[PDB]
Amino acid sequence: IHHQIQQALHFRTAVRVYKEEKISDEDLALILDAAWLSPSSIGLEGWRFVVLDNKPIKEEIKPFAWGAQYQLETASHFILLIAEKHARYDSPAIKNSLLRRGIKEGDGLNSRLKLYESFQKEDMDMADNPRALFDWTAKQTYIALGNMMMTAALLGIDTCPIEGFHYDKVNHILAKHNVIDLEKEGIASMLSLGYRLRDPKHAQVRKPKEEVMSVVK
């Protein structure tokens, strides 16, 4: 399993140009299962993963997506990662995550809601800052993003994680096609999936591992 994992870690690279060859529906389903089963802080699951097969919408997004030109053009599949806005402790979203989990009264539910108020007001210092609340739900999607990429790599499928686009212009294109509801949510990132047209030009580059990892004994 070590050699296999290590092989997947070195196989995953950010590829921009893909083969025409399409990912099977079974491989695609596995990848999305990895997203769906990902853990999210407080089990909120304030996120959605959208397979964008619609070619006109891709064409509309393209001029606003500097980091995604070739991927939007060539990728087998293109996934949008959406995060919930305004997921404040006193929101229905949060209210609904407790019920889902089998929490009820308002003395087991209003109790944990007391903790979530403390968590957002004090612990993470974000309750009264909508951008920070959005950035918090958006962070959970990066967990699913890593899970999808690792699953992909273990299947020999290439990916590219993408932030290189104008967020507000992409959000409005998505809202106008009713792909998202801009009141409730906004895009966090994009992920392309496919088979690389060719081997990467330059080798994998990272900081020396000592500048990144360490032990405090």
Add this chain to the structure above:
Amino acid sequence: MDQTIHHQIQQALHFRTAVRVYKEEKISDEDLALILDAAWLSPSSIGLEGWRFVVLDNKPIKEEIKPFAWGAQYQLETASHFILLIAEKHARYDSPAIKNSLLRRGIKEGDGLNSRLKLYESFQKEDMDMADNPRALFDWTAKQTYIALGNMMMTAALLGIDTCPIEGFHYDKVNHILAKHNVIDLEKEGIASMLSLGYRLRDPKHAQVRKPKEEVMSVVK
């Protein structure tokens, strides 16, 4: 199509659960190293790698964190290893960190470097609206560490190692404990999250809950 690999991934996805109480059994050096390699080798936006992953073995520091960590009480007590995910502050387009991330990749040659800096500038000012907003910039590097969080947890799961991702602590207070011990430079970096690792004492009583998959995943066209 490749059924053996599907089974292995499917086993790991259903194995992973957020584990609060661990047994005493420790993770091997080889398994911890692979897990950390998963974080190190993770992609980050623009190749910045504005992150550090620290194995917190020191028991006194764990003991000090504990009263301010409502979500990590049994994890700090019982976990085999505990990892702090640290993100860089002030990663503005014109910062030394952003410049070094280009140099690392051999980009320097006047307007290869400068031309990228110009893209990173519009990216932070216009695409993400964060160039002049240090909290947003921090949250942006902190987002990258969640990719590593994911890769670490999947690697652990494939290894049979239980895990728990942790945000349930007072960030300012924990930051101050970490700076006080010279674990971080608070002017340059801040904690993003923690991850406990180990072997579950036992399987959970209450099976995994998720939203119906139609409420999370969909296809446009």
